[PDB]
Amino acid sequence: RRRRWRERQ
Amino acid sequence: AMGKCPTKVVLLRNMVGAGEVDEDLEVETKEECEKYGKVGKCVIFEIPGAPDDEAVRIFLEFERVESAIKAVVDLNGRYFGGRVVKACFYNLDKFRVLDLAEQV
Ligand code: NA
């Protein structure tokens, strides 16, 4: 499955 | 403004564009949200005729208001793909009867 959430930077 | 009143329901906007909902989003978002606390499945509504950064509304109902607050604070301004997400609260009673197009 696609993973799109990115950690805050 | 209704999106600012803390509740256990979080509304996420600008995750994806109009017509771009898929199941991978819902599965991942529920997993991500479990970081803040126990949460239900994504409930999705698309507003007809809305701008591309508002059309798709993703709602998640947390078990606890504290978790919802944590979720709003962490998810607002985070990236889902290349899109900058907007997070806010949503009125619980409106949510429970599926009135999903309220102004926030
Ligand atoms: Na993820």
Side-chain angles (χ1 to χ4, degrees), chain A residues 1-8, chain B residues 1-29 31-33 35-40 42-85 87-104:
Chain A
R1 291 187 180 272
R2 299 182 71 176
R3 296 261 172 185
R4 284 169 283 187
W5 277 109
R6 293 166 62 198
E7 291 302 334
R8 188 184 301 264
Chain B
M2 181 268 267
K4 295 171 193 294
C5 293
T7 72
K8 68 194 180 171
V9 183
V10 175
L11 170 58
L12 306 177
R13 291 175 292 156
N14 198 43
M15 291 184 65
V16 296
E20 288 174 20
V21 173
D22 76 347
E23 184 178 85
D24 288 358
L25 176 159
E26 167 177 32
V27 171
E28 189 193 1
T29 300
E31 181 189 312
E32 187 70 17
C33 287
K35 300 180 184 180
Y36 314 115
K38 288 185 172 170
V39 75
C42 292
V43 166
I44 301 189
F45 187 68
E46 184 175 319
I47 301 175
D52 199 59
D53 56 1
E54 295 179 1
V56 175
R57 286 189 168 193
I58 306 296
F59 299 84
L60 302 89
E61 180 185 330
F62 290 86
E63 290 196 0
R64 301 178 303 96
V65 67
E66 178 184 29
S67 303
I69 295 166
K70 294 180 179 184
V72 167
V73 167
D74 197 58
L75 296 173
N76 190 255
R78 278 182 61 199
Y79 287 75
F80 185 79
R83 286 194 183 229
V84 180
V85 175
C88 67
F89 302 105
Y90 203 83
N91 185 268
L92 181 59
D93 283 357
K94 293 289 165 68
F95 179 69
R96 290 293 183 75
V97 302
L98 296 173
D99 279 355
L100 303 186
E102 301 294 296
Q103 191 80 41
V104 289

